[PDB]
Design a protein around this ligand. Structure first.
Ligand SMILES: *[C@@H]1O[C@H](CO)[C@@H](O[C@@H]2O[C@H](CO)[C@@H](O)[C@H](O)[C@H]2NC(C)=O)[C@H](O)[C@H]1NC(C)=O
Ligand SMILES: *[C@@H]1O[C@H](CO)[C@@H](O)[C@H](O)[C@H]1NC(C)=O
Ligand SMILES: *[C@@H]1O[C@H](CO)[C@@H](O)[C@H](O)[C@H]1NC(C)=O
Lengths: 66, 49
């Protein structure tokens, strides 16, 4: 249902979170289009302490490296 | 399978995710359900009883 990067939750803006066997992507609900999970496709809401089934993962920041 | 079996082949999906998408279909985002799951389930059980 959600992704827990660093003490926070991360819900998809549109689509579902999937993983083949090792890496997590976010994709649409009618066509398999995997994408790299960044801060643009997810919105933070919560504290990551009430959600059930949340995995940790590592999200990507597209601004700090540049 | 939600409503996905009304168009083509049935696709499995966890019930909480389907409920979250139904809530998102009326303008309320997913975090409301993902943080009030227990309360909503209790209310639904009380109503169905
Ligand atoms: C919710 O489901 C549970 C089963 O997982 C029901 O539990 C039993 O249901 C029978 C049938 O009515 C009752 O006679 C038992 O007393 C129930 N036991 C417990 C521990 O609840 C439960 O009735 C269901 N709830 C409702 C409102 O239908
Ligand atoms: C799963 O997706 C990742 C994405 O980088 C890929 O490297 C990998 O080969 C895919 N398959 C498996 C079995 O991990
Ligand atoms: C996520 O990381 C925290 C600390 O880094 C850890 O306590 C927690 O167990 C991790 N989540 C899972 C599902 O292992």
């Amino acid at each position: 249902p959600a992704i827990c990067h660093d003490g926070k939750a991360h819900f998809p803006r549109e689509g579902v979170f999937v993983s083949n066997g090792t890496h997590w992507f976010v994709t649409q609900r009618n066509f398999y289009e995997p994408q790299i999970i960044t801060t643009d496709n997810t919105f933070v809401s919560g504290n990551c302490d009430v959600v059930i089934g949340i995995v940790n993962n590592t999200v990507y920041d597209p601004l700090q490296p540049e | 399978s939600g409503w996905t079996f009304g168009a083509g082949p049935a696709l499995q999906i966890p019930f909480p995710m389907q409920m979250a998408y139904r809530f998102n279909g009326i303008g309320v985002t997913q975090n409301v359900l993902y943080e009030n799951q227990k309360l909503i389930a209790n209310q639904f059980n009380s109503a169905i009883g």
